[PDB]
Design a protein around this ligand. Structure first.
Ligand code: NI
Ligand code: NI
Ligand code: NI
Ligand code: NI
Ligand code: NI
Length: 144
């Protein structure tokens, strides 16, 4: 069914090294990203952020007593041409809200939506992703 054009982004990084967890998409294997996901009907952006973090990298933020920071930033961007097919007819814009998740250390990731994961220094991660909003969020909330 159609993806929804309201989404979240969670920049996951490790507090000690400042390396950024990057995940390799399966629909576009050249697309490495932080965690993104559609906000579903009747759920809030923070709810979606926590749900997608649990789904995509098997990190439970409530149980692990971690802190999902609302970055208080929302941007809108054009859906990539070759991925637009997954949205309702005529949907071309996506509105995305930003979140931060600092883990104490780099760790092993069990992932489900992706092909592979890498821990990268924040400029490398920012330079790797194809999404300008993901790049901006790493620059603004990891690098400072
Ligand atoms: Ni996702
Ligand atoms: Ni999803
Ligand atoms: Ni997902
Ligand atoms: Ni999904
Ligand atoms: Ni420790």
């Amino acid at each position: 069914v159609y993806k929804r054009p309201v989404s979240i982004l969670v920049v996951i990084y490790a507090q000690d090294t400042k390396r950024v967890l990057m995940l390799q998409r399966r629909d576009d294997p050249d697309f490495w990203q932080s965690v993104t996901g559609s906000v579903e009907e009747g759920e809030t952006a923070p709810q979606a952020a926590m749900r997608e973090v649990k789904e995509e990298v098997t990190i439970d933020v409530v149980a692990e007593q971690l802190t999902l920071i609302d970055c208080q930033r929302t941007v809108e961007f054009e859906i990539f041409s070759h991925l637009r097919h997954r949205y309702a007819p005529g949907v071309t814009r996506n509105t995305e809200s930003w979140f931060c998740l600092a883990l104490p250390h780099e760790r092993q990731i069990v992932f489900t939506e992706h092909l592979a994961y890498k821990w990268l220094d924040a400029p490398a991660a920012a330079a790797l992703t194809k999404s300008w909003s993901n790049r901006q969020a790493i620059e603004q909330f990891v690098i400072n």
